[PDB]
Amino acid sequence: SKEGSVAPKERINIKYIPATGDAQAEVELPLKTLVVGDFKGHAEQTPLEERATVTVDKNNFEAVMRESELKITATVKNKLTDDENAELPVELNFKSLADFAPDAVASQVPELKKLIELREALVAL
């Protein structure tokens, strides 16, 4: 209760009352923006009215990506050989922005990962 409590009436009654006069207190409104876009590699089966919004800030941005679960199934030209009919299909997964670095790309693509392993073996000479 926001009314303020008082004791039962006596001959002498003392009450603290804040002198705000008739001033109407007010609430500051935040500036909220809504970013709408294709943040995944596929459309969702859930209806627009059912899928929920996600609050994002500096202290949880990466957490949000992790929870959103990103995945890319795609095919690129296979240039590790000399055949125009050679194609390479990859299945990339992302938890944070660091996962878009070439370092991560290689680690999630065996066809390159093994070549990196080779590189290290050659360096070890």
């Binding site: 500036l31 923006t33 709408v36 009215e49 800030d57 949000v64 890319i72 795609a74 070439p102 070549l115």
Partner: protein
């Protein structure tokens, strides 16, 4: 011997990088990356301690249309529920300040229809919808041919743009804003400028500049809105190099030219003042690049809406003045926040003993809060108190006791947005 081993490593990495380019230059991959990278670029330039918030809602353009076409009316759309119903129209809730759509629009009828619906939604919620324009909108392959366009005004006379022309005449167009060229999000990978671990990767951008990780300018514009609010709790300071429409700290990329060196422009092109003005006339928000720097600026934020012409009389010119203020986002943002404050604060007053003149008295005392009617208030004061004058009239809804009809009209401080100068040499001039 080792020298040959090193050569093996060179050729190995050469081959690996050739493949690595294909993934990193994959359109699906870049769509994903640019979305999230651009999002952070926005997020980490805001200040959440200043009562700024942002929510993510995953939606494709296609399924936006699916929903808007599926529903019988916009008031029953899923997006309407997320924007209006669960916010502005909810006691104890909060209203969405603005909507940033990570999309590129063409002149296609589907794109036009989508904009129509977003205009309606924004109008109802009192929040602008900002997004971007695709290169093909101007009949060109990429934004790098904008210098070859001799006249945009004449270009838009084509039958091709019929629906777009009608869109610009709608009263809902005030809540639409579209931006022009994109901008770089990432400097190409480089042993010196942007190195990676282990693998000696040197990213090779080809003749196609679409190999660069371009980002959606709408987000840049969004940070402009945030900064203004963070400082003043109002959003009009978003249209100038010094006023707050300046985009600082863009990515750079020096590379070999014709034996010389040059940097890839952060925006696809270096927009000239005349070209920028042309785009402004056609209702586009062009982020222009400051030549030779890493800074860009929004010189104005006109909405989609086309200004109406009135008869050249005292009254007619006043009508033009009034209508043009409506067509520009720096002023509409003032109205939008006022709408939001009225909705909230008035609900608190429902059930109070108010007679007609009680509302006039109180509403007057309230609006004065944001008025700076001094002879010459400093720009800082003008920023936090955007209004110069305001007028309120309250009438009764006849045959319905307790209901009132309120009219609120305001005169904002004006932004400096252009001037003509006449220079003249003169003898016997009065001495200053």
């Amino acid at each position: 011997n080792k020298s040959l081993v090193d050569q093996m490593l060179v050729e190995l990495d050469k081959k690996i990088s050739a493949q690595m380019d294909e993934i990193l230059h994959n359109s699906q991959f870049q769509a994903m990356e640019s979305a999230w990278r651009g999002l952070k670029l926005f997020v980490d330039r805001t200040d959440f301690r200043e009562n700024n918030k942002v929510e993510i809602l995953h939606v494709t353009k296609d399924e936006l249309l699916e929903d808007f076409e599926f529903a019988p009316e916009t008031a029953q759309s899923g997006l309407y529920k997320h924007v209006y119903s669960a916010g502005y129209g909810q006691f104890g809730g909060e209203p969405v300040g603005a909507i940033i759509g990570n999309y590129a629009f063409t002149p296609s009828t589907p794109d036009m229809k989508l904009l129509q619906y977003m205009g309606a939604l924004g109008a109802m919620a009192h929040a602008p919808f900002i997004s971007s324009v695709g290169p093909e909108f101007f009949g060109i392959d990429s934004f790098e041919e904008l210098p070859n366009i001799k006249d945009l005004k004449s270009t838009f006379e084509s039958p091709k743009y019929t629906k777009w022309r009608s869109l610009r005449e709608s009263e809902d167009a005030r809540y639409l804003g579209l931006t022009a060229p994109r901008f770089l999000l990432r400097v190409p990978y480089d042993p010196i400028e942007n190195p990676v671990k282990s693998f000696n990767y040197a990213e090779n951008v080809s003749a196609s500049h679409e190999h660069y990780l371009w980002g959606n300018t709408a987000f840049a514009f969004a940070t402009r809105l945030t900064d203004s609010f963070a400082k003043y709790r109002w959003c009009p300071n978003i249209i100038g190099p010094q006023s707050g429409g300046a985009v600082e700290d863009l990515p750079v990329h020096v590379f070999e030219s014709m034996g010389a060196l040059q940097s890839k422009i952060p925006t696809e092109v270096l927009i000239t003042d005349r070209k920028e003005f042309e785009l402004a006339e056609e209702g586009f928000i062009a982020l222009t690049m400051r030549k030779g720097s890493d800074n860009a600026a929004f010189f104005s934020a006109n909405s989609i809406q086309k200004p109406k012409v009135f008869p050249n009389t005292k009254e007619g010119k006043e009508a033009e003045t009034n209508y043009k203020l409506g067509t520009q986002l720096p002023y509409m943002m003032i109205i939008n926040r006022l709408a939001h404050y009225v909705k909230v604060l008035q609900r608190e007053q429902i059930g109070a003993w108010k007679e007609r003149q009680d509302l006039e008295r109180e509403l007057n005392s309230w609006i004065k809060q944001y008025v700076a009617d001094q002879e010459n208030p400093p720009a800082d004061v003008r920023s936090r108190r955007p209004l110069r004058a305001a007028r309120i009239e309250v009438m009764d809804v006849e045959g319905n006791p307790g209901w009132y009809q309120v009219s609120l009209s305001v005169r904002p401080h004006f932004k400096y947005m252009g001037a003509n100068f006449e220079l003249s040499l003169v003898g016997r001039l009065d001495q200053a």
